[PDB]
């Protein structure tokens, strides 16, 4: 029964069978109950604060060739850009001036900055009294060590898919084993460590999604970023189907149920495939929002997938936009850095 699966989730009997059935049931009443459960767990464990992470996508140069990603190296159609270190620091300062308590630096895997330019930038942003999150992809342990020494607080490295065969096919420069070793290294170095997957990748099954949930639970990640796969026309996956919003939303809800004290963003991809998708996701277990703080003329060139929200908006629009969002949702903006606040339990 849908009823029995909810009871088992409520009782924290997180068996593969329970998770598979939750993901497989396509009953509206069940889905709405699951979303309510996640929303309640979110409210109880992490409260009504929605944490704002200002993201600066500072370079779209990439050395890797992931089949799903518009920044893949084989995409010749794309104008490549790099913000200067001074531009990045001053852009971060403007976000802090707008009230951002976390700055997220994200890029393609761009060799130019690695590792010392990143270290310099992180040190300057840390002087501003905010959290710094890096999302720069896979690099040697030494680089991650230098960045932690420089003051970085968190690292987002989505695991993408926990199916090693699918992972290797979609990410031909690397492997799930590498990705996992990176994530374990980040944990060992003391970063708040973020993982998470895409939903609806070509060839990905419900069993794969269950494996993603069990992977996340196993490693007790501090942040989990989940979103639908969105096909990009200048990639080998151009003609594949987009991920299903409702299924992806169920993954978010189950992640909250499994990791009740984690930080879980309402990802931009959720807002891209369905108008108002981020707001929905914030009401089904998410507690974090990541407004775009990349300046023009670069914002429109960071084309991981098409249709990406925020691209046509003014340079400073997105922090005010999410503050309005937070208020109309009956929520509150985060007061502190929004680090993970563990609730130890049984
Ligand atoms: C009560 C009100 C009259 C009708 C008119 C439009 C209806 C919504 C829309 O259909 C979209 C959506 C469809 C889903 O299936 C169930 C949820 C949603 C939000 C509906 C809820 C409800 O039924 C609405 C508000
Ligand atoms: C606004 C919308 C229509 C409400 C309505 O008109 N009836 C009445 O009272 C008198 S009268 O019938 O209107 O005359 C209702 C119908 C179903 C509702 C969602 C589901 O619960 C799942 C989920 C639960 C979470 O906790 C919060 C988020 C979610 C997405 C909900 C949001 C919202 O709440 C929805 C869309
Ligand atoms: C940057 C700019 C000049 C002054 C300045 O440099 N202040 C630095 C303030 C640093 N704080 C945020 C840490 C305090 C100041 C002047 C007016 C300020 C906005 C308004 O208040 C409304 C709103 C309040 C929210 O809460 C945060 C967002 C908003 C849009 C603000 C952003 C920013 O703050 C503005 C633009
Ligand atoms: C209107 C829009 C298409 C255009 C479709 C696409 C995805 C749909 C939502 C999701 O299914 C999740 C959720 C299921 C609940 O049962 C009813 C509420 C929710 C929020 C849905 C409302 C509505 O139906 C959406 C937004
Ligand atoms: C300037 C901009 C238009 C409006 C739209 C939404 C407004 C915020 C929300 O009201 C929530 C919150 C209420 C507090 O009272 C003061 C701070 C907050 C962050 C507001 C600041 C500012 O007023 C905002 C950004
Ligand atoms: C663009 S990468 C930038 C950071 C770093 N290069 C990395 O791969 O971790 C950020 C995230 O974008 C997501 N992404 C890339 N292409 C996508 C697509 N077509 N649809 C949805 N998400 C996508 C992936 O999950 C990835 O972890
Ligand atoms: S997902 Fe990250 S590593 Fe892969 S091509 Fe895109 S930017 Fe490069
Ligand atoms: S942050 Fe909401 S549209 Fe840009
Ligand atoms: Cl973060
Ligand atoms: Cl995203
Ligand atoms: S925005
Ligand atoms: S927004």
Swiss-Prot record:
Record GO terms (molecular function):
2 iron, 2 sulfur cluster binding; 4 iron, 4 sulfur cluster binding; metal ion binding; oxidoreductase activity; transferase activity
CDD domains, A to Z? Radical_SAM (cd01335)
- EC code: 1.8.-.-
Relay the cofactor remark from the entry: Binds 1 [4Fe-4S] cluster. The cluster is coordinated with 3 cysteines and an exchangeable S-adenosyl-L-methionine. Binds 1 [2Fe-2S] cluster.
Residues at which [2Fe-2S] cluster binds: 310, 318, 321
Q: What Gene3D superfamilies does the entry give?
A: Aldolase class I
Any one Pfam family match given in the protein's UniProt record, by short name:
Radical_SAM
Gene Ontology biological process terms, A to Z: sulfur compound biosynthetic process; water-soluble vitamin biosynthetic process
Record bears the keyword Lyase = no
According to the entry, every stretch annotated as the Radical SAM core domain falls at 48-267
Name the cofactor(s) required for activity, per the record. [4Fe-4S] cluster; [2Fe-2S] cluster
Q: Which UniProt keywords apply?
A: 2Fe-2S, 4Fe-4S, Iron, Iron-sulfur, Metal-binding, Oxidoreductase, S-adenosyl-L-methionine
Residues binding [4Fe-4S] cluster, per UniProt? 62, 66, 69
Subunit text: Monomer.
Q: Which family does it belong to?
A: Belongs to the radical SAM superfamily. HydE family.
Protein name (database record): [FeFe] hydrogenase maturase subunit HydE
Organism this protein belongs to: Thermotoga maritima (strain ATCC 43589 / DSM 3109 / JCM 10099 / NBRC 100826 / MSB8)
């Amino acid at each position: 029964t849908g009823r029995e699966i909810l009871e088992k989730l409520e009782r924290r009997e997180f068996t593969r069978e329970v998770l598979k059935e939750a993901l497989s049931i396509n009953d509206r009443g069940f889905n709405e109950a699951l979303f309510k459960l996640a929303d309640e767990i979110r409210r109880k464990y992490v409260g009504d604060e929605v944490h704002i992470r200002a993201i600066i996508e500072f370079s779209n140069v990439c050395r890797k060739n992931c089949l799903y990603c518009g920044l893949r190296r084989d995409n010749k159609n794309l104008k490549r850009y790099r913000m200067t270190p001074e531009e990045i620091v001053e852009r971060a300062r403007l976000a802090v001036q707008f009230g951002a308590k976390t700055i997220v630096l994200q890029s393609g895997e761009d060799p130019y900055y690695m590792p010392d330019v990143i270290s310099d930038i992180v040190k300057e942003i840390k002087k501003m009294g905010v959290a710094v999150t890096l999302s720069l992809g896979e690099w040697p342990r030494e680089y991650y060590e230098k960045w932690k020494e420089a003051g970085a607080d968190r690292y987002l490295l989505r695991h993408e898919t926990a199916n090693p065969v699918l992972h290797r096919k979609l990410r031909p420069d690397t492997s799930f084993e590498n990705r996992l070793n990176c994530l374990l290294t980040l944990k060992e170095l003391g970063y708040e460590t973020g993982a998470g997957s895409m939903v609806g990748l070509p060839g990905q099954t419900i069993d794969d999604l269950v494996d993603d949930l069990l992977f996340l639970k196993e490693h007790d990640f501090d942040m989990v970023g989940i979103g639908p796969f969105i096909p990009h026309p200048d990639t080998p996956l151009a003609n594949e189907k987009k991920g299903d919003f409702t299924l992806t939303l169920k993954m978010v809800a189950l992640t909250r149920i499994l990791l009740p004290d984690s930080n879980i963003p309402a990802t931009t991809a959720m807002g891209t495939i369905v108008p108002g998708g981020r707001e929905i996701t914030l009401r089904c277990g998410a507690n974090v929002i990541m407004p775009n703080w990349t300046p023009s003329p670069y914002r429109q060139l960071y084309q991981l997938y098409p249709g990406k929200i925020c691209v046509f908006e003014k340079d400073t629009a997105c922090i005010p936009c999410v503050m309005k969002m937070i208020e109309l949702l009956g929520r509150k903006p985060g007061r502190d850095w929004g680090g993970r606040k563990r609730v130890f339990e049984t």
